[PDB]
Symmetry: C3
Subunit: 488 residues, 3 copies
């Protein structure tokens, strides 16, 4: 009646969330946000990157020019999408070091092809086969030139092509392995051929083998595919006395953001910076557990399927009492505030400055975390369909190492950040209590439960002056000292 | 007129330990625990992983079937242990890309071998040599079939074997390099042979060289070993006109947790999840400095030989004084407590709740740290006995990079955790002081040394009620104010 | 009569912005750069042995191109290859050049030991006008161009045992003649074969006539191969033509040597860390100059600046204490006292709280500013040729590493700066509370970081509070009489 109670408190919610800290595996906070992206729509968005659907064609088949890949001539991409239904339907072939050729073409991002006029005087050009029909006609890989005998002879070819440009030229060429000695001599006269392709820096010599290829699509013969990159100022030199599958010119090599991905996901009309084989994913979260294979501005792949970042204080659900006892579920207009009991009854008011200070700090850490860009393009392969040994062991170990270090960083980051969020929101509460304590000077005592006993009549305007920071302790000091320091 | 003193304090020990924090290179705490495992028993425990001691056999010699390795036929392992004393005692051989074959067989974890009936019409099978005695008889690698001439001729072999199964088949085969032209024609009739082994995806064509092998165990000849993996739906094609060392069938390729390790540690009867070349090591600690080569559920390798995690507070060794001055070596039944001086003498009591609060938080961190799992199986090689250039530079760099990043994580983690342990144990002391301060209301004053002057007569039951949280300050307030506020 | 005692901390007019866990930009009184971002542009010739390749690549110095003769038997910690280097001997190519360059660079020596191979039956020391040594047709000094003798070139079978306890590096080659006429004039056989074997390995190369493009007058060339022979093993050479034989071996060593491509001049100075841009200081833990380095180097990161706070929050400025703002006129300490009393007014630093904060910051600086990180031969990180799988993996490994270190550096600075701000705020509060507890009932907290002291409190009395010897009992009667009026 001669006194009043002023309690300091913080909000609480009925539906709290559990997060991890440095200290505690599970502490309940008022709010949290997920840092691991774990779902995809399942479709590859066709913006903002240039997506090229390979459909029935591998990139290598589009490169060589298998007839059902003719629509890919001179195509370009940011991301070539290779489908598991793709098939070859041209002359049987193999590519030693297939993976490297696929990778370097994928990274170049273009099949831009420039015809060159090689001087093939002495041999016949444009061989074709019923194994490689283009429409109804016997035909061949569009970018390769199948040379064979002319006028019953096949001379030693010595043919050059200088690179007088300022970019690297990619030449694709091949070696034919006939099924029989009869086919060998019918096509090339010599009983054994030889293909040598040279630059000033390199030499690739292949001796064909008769009868070495298994039966594929009607033929027990095949071509082996090789490649040569000619730098500016260098020269392509081709020397052969049989079995040469010649280039018709070069692919222009570019550098940039292009890559390739294996995926059976449909392409859709939508926009997304991050692509995975499962489909595009949002990149607002810093981490993701959808696929270690990605392209674009992507969250970092981690092993965790959920990491919860606290975005609110500890949740401590509900005469009056202050924050030492529990939080206040009825406070919805701020995070911290005041409840009082005085000659006008009880009331409650949020404290706006302490609430914003806590919110500002939390939004700051959110903006540090919700900010990362991490755009990556052509990388290494991360899934393999063949058993290979040493190099594949190293590719897998590098990726496994990377994911374990990022998963550790993610785990530690959330635990540290959450500990710090709990600490800074506790700290805002204590600061408001101490600020109030020092306004009241000798006119109040701390009751030990987050409340002050104010030793003077302290109606609603007077409480308001405390909340407002304008309380004048000298106006009330005589009344309060007289009430506090009696000995009755 | 009399008064009393109540001091709040924390324990101290006479034998502290030094730890690192963010701030301090060496601060003494009451207790700490080692996070780096730095010893091994020196024995490889034979549980829980299936250990296969190679004894005198390398994995490759067991694979090919050198006679003194006959006992390894169809063996399996989680970890094959290769001994430095191993030796070859059969036909001299070399393996181009030995490391990859060793890796992929080790990773497959089995020598399960399935005989197939290749059609060798036209040649003689089962060649043997006195360099490869099996019992008293000239013999040969058990898994290889040495073909040579029949009825004075060696025809062009064209032999196939389809993979109609749903797993990969591993074929091991070889090429014979005779010492002389006489040996060449005596065995194979043709003056130069050729071994071609093909699938739809690949071709390995080897031209044998007469006289190219150095003298080894009585022979200036040798075989070179190659391998071919045939995927389901593919086919093995073997084409040869001499010098073929044929497969007798295939090894079944598996995927799983198997690997291989080089070690001379003895195998013992015991149980340990983590295996290193030095022997098994315990994995209760998160880090280890024993060997970067490990197998199983292992601590992470780091460069440090010791990292001490604080598990107790800072150690700070006629009247009593509180925590401001130093810790209390005589408090042995709790971490925090009370000392008093009153009209009944001097006394001491531990505070159980604040002690548990500190202990529970520390145990929280310990379980977060001491819970590391980290199970790894087949990895990359990390020690090398040959000089190799580019690929080995990359293998070493990847591992060096990994170890430096984990060593950094381990150092930072321990420094942060220790700072936090010191802060949280300091915080519990302060909270207990402030709780006591607010219980006492106007009846005591803080003397500034961690003690309260209690301004009233305050016998043992009264002290107990403060420690117990049942002190009623109104009972004593008139007495205390009268003693506090005199003007004499 | 009363006094006022304010507790406060310093401030500066020229503060610096740093990042914390909470804040992208908070101003502190002082900070230090953790990223090295400049170089002088010269490679210091101490303390590492630098060998300037000048006009010579390492491989040309290894083979022994005549204008590289001065490099015979040289050694290095770091071989510096210059972009102006050129070849001027017989045209050659090296399959897997990069690996040979790497293992020689890492070995750190061109020490060559001549051995007496038995070439009876062929002629030794073939030479060419494309490879002049002085006025004479010559050849690579370390290679032996063998050709026919007495109209024949027999099947050579030549061995050289390694009876030593180190590995021997053998460099050898295969000649590709321009024409069949050249092939048979030199080697009689219309097609040669070079086989080089150990117990562990076999390298068989078939030469090809006419396969090399025209270079410096010749449509001919040699291809270079290498073989390492371990102790107890043997080199075996078998050839019936086109063999470019070794003259002996290079001794392989292990140690800290490497190679670097750079056009930076070599200077007389001392620096532990070398980059292609020049040497850099290694006092900072991070650097943004070049991911290629050699020696005791800061770790490469993507950021071009990371500022580590080395002082408290900067809060620029009767008297008032730290609740209101910092004190720009306090230049002798970080924390201190301002008073108003019967003798006037003054300001004094508190040395103990200042030193306590400074010691903690110097502690974290020592953890940061100490790292050594000495690295020597690593992987290549820039590439002049398009290659596919292995180069993709080399690039990815390095990109992965740099992103992980850049993250560690960003987090370290944000965490440390938060902690520096927290610990310097904490020293301020601790000094206020210490003063509060000295004053007992003789003062009240005015709420602005100051105490009203309710008694006469002259300079010696203020000094006793600063010193921790204030005796509250001496003044308590006077103070209680002034506080508790009605
Ligand atoms: C070397 O041996 C292999 C295995 O015997 C031979 O491959 C076989 O070649 C025949 C035709 O030359 C293939 O027959 C074809 O079968 C298809 C469908 O089965 C049929 O439509 C065709 O009309 C034709 O009859 C057979 O499939 C193929 N087998 C395998 C396993 O590849 C190869 O031709 C031999 N090469 C020689 C002797 O030069
Ligand atoms: C090519 O030349 C090398 C030597 O330049 C020949 O190697 C030598 O071969 C003979 C056998 O013909 C080996 O003789 C053996 O020596 C041991 C003693 O260690 C003895 O116990 C045996 O009874 C036998 O006499 C000799 O050791 C070996 N030398 C080396 C250095 O390996 C090689 O055989 C020649 N190859 C051809 C195809 O001609
Ligand atoms: C295979 O064909 C190539 C392409 O023509 C031949 O290369 C050419 O060879 C001639 C000499 O045989 C070179 O002529 C020289 O040109 C320089 C001009 O820089 C001149 O100064 C010399 O006096 C001489 O005339 C020509 O440069 C060269 N062309 C190229 C593009 O390299 C090659 O010789 C043929 N190989 C065989 C074995 O026939
Ligand atoms: C709980 O926390 C989240 C994260 O801070 C809050 O969500 C943000 O809300 C603002 C305004 O509505 C949006 O502009 C942001 O985009 C949201 N961020 C995220 C990461 O979702 C949410 O408002 C908080 N409060 C609750 C749920 O009561
Ligand atoms: C995204 O795709 C990956 C790869 O196809 C999915 O991972 C496979 O999941 C199945 C069943 O969950 C497992 O049997 C395979 O072992 C997984 N493969 C790999 C390579 O990890 C993943 O589940 C997909 N995620 C989403 C969200 O669609
Ligand atoms: C475990 O074995 C490793 C490898 O043998 C030991 O490391 C070697 O130690 C010797 C002498 O201490 C050195 O000369 C070698 O250079 C070290 N080799 C490598 C690869 O590091 C290691 O000391 C052993 N540890 C334990 C606990 O037994
Ligand atoms: C700002 O902070 C830097 C870092 O502590 C101070 O520079 C140090 O000063 C001492 C004494 O002069 C030197 O011995 C150290 O080598 C310096 N360290 C570095 C990293 O430069 C500098 O003195 C501080 N400035 C002010 C005005 O206090
Ligand atoms: C690198 O090579 C060039 C070309 O051989 C050298 O420059 C020549 O130097 C000689 C003697 O000093 C002169 O007679 C020539 O006229 C120069 N030619 C040219 C084109 O400049 C140069 O000296 C060599 N540099 C080093 C460091 O050895
Ligand atoms: C080095 O090689 C030559 C050539 O093969 C060896 O010369 C033969 O030596 C034997 C006797 O030692 C003679 O009967 C042959 O007539 C020799 N051939 C010729 C043409 O000289 C010579 O022995 C070998 N040298 C060494 C030191 O082993
Ligand atoms: C050190 O040298 C590197 C490499 O030459 C410089 O990096 C190049 O910088 C220019 C402009 O910044 C770019 O166009 C190139 O793409 C950069 N190359 C690479 C490989 O990054 C770097 O700027 C130099 N640093 C210093 C401090 O001199
Ligand atoms: C709690 O419920 C509110 C109101 O429905 C909702 O907006 C909020 O996101 C929920 N918070 C948590 C942490 O579940
Ligand atoms: C792919 O090939 C199959 C079989 O030729 C055909 O039915 C289908 O139309 C093709 N798809 C595309 C996109 O061309
Ligand atoms: C092509 O080469 C032949 C030499 O075989 C030559 O005679 C002919 O003139 C060349 N043609 C052109 C267009 O240069
Ligand atoms: C010291 O710490 C270890 C690790 O937590 C613990 O097991 C041990 O009991 C502690 N010792 C004492 C005396 O408390
Ligand atoms: C100090 O000695 C006791 C012996 O009773 C031991 O139990 C305790 O762990 C030791 N303290 C530390 C920090 O090791
Ligand atoms: C290994 O070989 C030696 C020599 O043949 C033999 O004495 C020993 O018994 C062999 N060890 C095993 C385990 O077979
Ligand atoms: C093996 O092949 C020969 C080659 O003509 C053939 O005659 C023979 O019948 C085949 N043998 C079997 C068992 O099929």
């Amino acid at each position: 009646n001669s006194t009043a109670t002023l309690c300091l408190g913080h909000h609480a919610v009925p539906n709290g969330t559990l997060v991890k800290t440095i200290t505690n595996d599970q502490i309940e906070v008022t709010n949290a946000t997920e840092l691991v992206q774990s779902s995809s729509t399942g479709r590859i968005c066709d913006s903002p990157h240039r997506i090229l659907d390979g459909k029935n064609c591998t990139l290598i088949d589009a490169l060589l020019g298998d007839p059902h890949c003719d629509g890919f001539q001179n195509e370009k991409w940011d991301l070539f999408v290779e489908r598991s239904k793709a098939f070859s339907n041209c002359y049987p072939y193999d590519v030693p070091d297939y993976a490297s050729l696929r990778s370097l073409v994928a990274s170049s991002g273009t099949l831009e092809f420039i015809n060159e006029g090689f001087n093939w005087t002495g041999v016949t050009q444009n061989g074709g086969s019923y194994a490689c029909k283009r429409g109804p006609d016997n035909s061949f890989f569009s970018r390769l030139n199948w040379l064979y005998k002319s006028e019953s002879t096949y001379p030693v070819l010595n043919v050059t092509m200088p690179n007088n440009d300022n970019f690297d030229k990619l030449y694709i060429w091949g070696v034919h392995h006939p099924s029989t000695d009869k086919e060998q001599t019918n096509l090339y006269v010599q009983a054994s051929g030889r293909v040598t392709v040279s630059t000033k820096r390199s030499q690739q010599t292949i001796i064909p083998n008769v009868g070495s290829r298994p039966w594929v699509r009607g033929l027990s013969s095949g071509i082996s595919i090789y490649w040569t990159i000619v730098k500016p100022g260098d020269i392509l030199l081709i020397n052969s006395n049989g079995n040469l599958i010649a280039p018709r010119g070069y692919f222009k090599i570019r550098t940039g953001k292009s890559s390739i991905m294996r995926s059976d996901a449909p392409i859709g009309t939508c926009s997304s910076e991050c692509i995975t084989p499962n489909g595009s994913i949002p990149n607002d979260k810093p981490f993701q557990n959808v696929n270690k294979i990605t392209y674009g501005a992507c969250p970092k792949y981690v092993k965790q399927n959920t990491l919860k970042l606290a975005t609110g204080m500890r949740n401590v659900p509900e005469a009056i009492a202050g924050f030492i006892e529990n939080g206040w579920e009825g406070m919805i207009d701020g995070w911290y505030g005041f409840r009082h009991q005085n000659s006008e009854g009880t009331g409650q008011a949020a404290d706006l400055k302490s609430t914003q200070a806590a919110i500002d700090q939390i939004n700051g850490k959110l903006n540090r975390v919700i900010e990362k860009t991490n755009e990556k393009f052509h990388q290494i392969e991360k899934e393999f369909s063949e058993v290979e040994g040493r190099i594949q062991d190293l590719e897998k170990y590098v990726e496994d190492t990377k994911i374990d270090l990022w998963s550790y960083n993610a785990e530690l980051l959330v635990a540290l950040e959450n500990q710090h969020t709990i600490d800074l929101t506790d700290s805002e509460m204590n600061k408001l209590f101490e600020k109030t304590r020092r306004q009241l000077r000798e006119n109040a005592e701390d009751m030990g439960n987050g409340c002050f006993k104010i030793y003077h009549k302290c109606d609603n305007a007077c409480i308001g002056s405390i909340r407002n920071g304008t309380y004048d302790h000298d106006v009330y000091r005589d009344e309060a000292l007289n009430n506090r320091f009696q000995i009755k």
